[PDB]
Design a protein around this ligand. Structure first.
Ligand SMILES: Cc1cc2nc3c(=O)[nH]c(=O)nc-3n(C[C@H](O)[C@H](O)[C@H](O)COP(=O)(O)O)c2cc1C
Ligand SMILES: Cc1cc2nc3c(=O)[nH]c(=O)nc-3n(C[C@H](O)[C@H](O)[C@H](O)COP(=O)(O)O)c2cc1C
Lengths: 337, 337
């Protein structure tokens, strides 16, 4: 058998949910409980492994709730936790009694706090937590990654002139755009380094990594002529480095502070290729290793060898600029005065 | 009045706790509940602001529990949540009844999950959460920081030779040492960047920032002759850059991913000074701005001007090396073969 636990955010209607679960959970011989408290669901489900999983994939796509996080998975259990409840619904709001109110209030406060912490988490950890894996004890492994690096053109002159709030508005907008597109193509964001976005793709995701690069460049171009001139967003440009190689993926740090990152020379290479694009007529630079993972009929352009042994640099025709890097940089400064 | 909520980890004895709280919580006219479940405390406390705070400082130093996190603070409440319980203790393990078991199990699972997420958190966020501040809505502010940067000497040759697990053992040991010392002197760690540790100190913490730098250098020296030669730890060296200036402190990112970092040119400067020490006869390099925040009678040594306008670089005599940077680097490589 098998048992999992998840939480989710909602979007008499819950009564239609439990009427169903009961019938289907006997049809497939399942038990568990559904709690509702302050617009959040909590569910425990237990039963034969194939039957419990056929159900939770159905649950994942139910549009009655969002931001689903599976906290816990127990494999090959032997004793059910609620053998007599096909699916028991406990509306924790209807309960007004004294002795459940403390536990009611704490469940609310921990889970809400929890939901806030989730947004500062490494995507990989949240993924591990969903798959039942313990992030703190997982063993760091050597994996093959495409490494992605993007940051803001002449950002230090954007921070130089704008007031703090426009800086933040601008950085957050940049980060929204980057992560939405990376995540849509199947990449994972590793972390933010100042103005920089570090991500990874798999070795079957070369095309998706170039497409990600071009799309970001594209949305920033549209964004610049969508807004008025006096909007700092009018001044937002990026350059993107891709590398490929082996990296160590895992957790690092002491008891008092943990991080779940990627170590390996390819990390440095993508960052240097990213910075290389400030001297290139292209916004995207990548290695030959990235090119090998690319199946699509890209028009690859060779930018020669660069720097402790030199490496070959490539780009695609679609990453060409219609601007000069020191032109944009003096233009940014002239605008802000 | 005022009300807070915290959780902590434990180290009939709980019976001695509640017997006390009751008497003192009436003495100072306080109410709330204490839950115990699977080696974790949960407490809600409410009352007049001066009285509730005199108590929680006492609680913080009680050695019966550790890893105390205050989740929630409510200011100037008007209605108490438990007006009749000076301090009601609910041992959630003693309860075996059916209808509390689901809520019992969920409270356990969320809070445990919670505890795991806390270890991937920005120190500043955990601090904000403790002080009652909402991290997601706090407004990013411009602050004066000493910026700290440390990373591992010729790390790319350590990753080149050692197997993955020795890399991780070695990085984790480095990070334990760095964060323990930074945190002891009063700094905060911002994040980890690969082999790099980024931290900040206040402008009244110059001496503490140099002391932090020297102590780390010191512990790594001791560590190298404490271990056998064949231990990768025998090969672990660091360089440290300090800068000073204005940075933006706050949260950045989209709904789907949030980070709580420091933006500003001083971040880049400390990183470049850090890298500068690979060509210097010292392991610590800092700006004149850092020197100004230093009150202690340091023997400051001037390393000239470096690089887009050049800045003056300083170090202290105590940061001198007894090694050559390219000697250690070829020595590391020779060892590993
Ligand atoms: C929070 C939540 C929990 C649910 N739990 C169950 C459950 O335990 N068992 C179940 O059969 N359906 C559950 N559902 C509803 C599923 O969508 C359901 O399996 C589906 O409507 C079945 O459709 P079908 O019989 O046509 O295949 C749940 C829905 C929600 C929102
Ligand atoms: C989890 C926990 C909760 C506590 N809650 C209270 C409380 O609510 N009120 C209280 O007076 N003491 C509480 N204490 C114990 C304090 O240490 C206590 O105030 C102290 O022993 C008083 O000493 P004094 O009367 O000599 O000043 C708590 C201790 C623990 C571990």
């Amino acid at each position: 058998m098998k048992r999992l636990v998840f939480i989710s955010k909602i979007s008499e209607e819950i009564q239609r949910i439990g009427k169903v679960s009961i019938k289907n959970n006997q049809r497939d011989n399942i038990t568990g409980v559904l709690l509702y408290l302050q617009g959040l669901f909590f569910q425990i489900l237990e039963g034969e492994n194939e039957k419990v999983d056929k159900l939770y994939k159905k649950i994942l796509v139910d549009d009655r709730h969002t931001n689903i996080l599976c906290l816990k998975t127990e494999y090959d259990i032997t004793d059910r936790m609620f053998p007599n409840w096909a699916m028991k619904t406990i509306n924790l709001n209807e309960n007004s009694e004294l002795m459940i109110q403390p536990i009611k209030s704490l469940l609310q406060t921990i889970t809400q706090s929890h939901r806030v912490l989730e947004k500062y988490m490494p995507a990989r950890v949240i993924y591990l937590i969903n798959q039942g894996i313990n992030p703190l004890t997982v063993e760091p492994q050597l994996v093959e990654k495409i490494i992605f690096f993007s940051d803001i053109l002449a950002f230090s002159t954007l921070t130089e002139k704008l007031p703090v709030n426009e800086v933040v508005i601008l950085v957050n907008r940049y980060f929204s755009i980057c992560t939405r597109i990376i995540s849509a193509y199947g990449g994972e964001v590793t972390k933010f380094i100042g103005d920089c976005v570090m991500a990874s793709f798999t070795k079957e995701q070369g095309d998706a990594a170039i497409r990600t690069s071009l799309d970001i460049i594209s949305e920033l171009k549209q964004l610049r002529h969508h807004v008025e001139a006096t909007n700092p967003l009018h001044l937002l440009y990026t350059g993107i480095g891709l590398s490929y190689g082996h990296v160590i993926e895992g957790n690092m740090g002491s008891s008092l502070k943990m991080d779940h990152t990627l170590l390996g020379d390819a990390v440095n290479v993508a960052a240097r290729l990213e910075a290389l694009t400030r001297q290139l007529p292209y916004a995207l630079a990548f290695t030959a290793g990235v090119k090998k993972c690319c199946q699509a009929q890209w028009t690859f352009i060779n930018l020669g060898a660069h720097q402790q042994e030199a490496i070959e640099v490539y780009t695609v025709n679609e990453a060409q600029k219609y601007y000069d890097t020191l032109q944009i940089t003096q233009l940014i400064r002239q605008t802000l005065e």
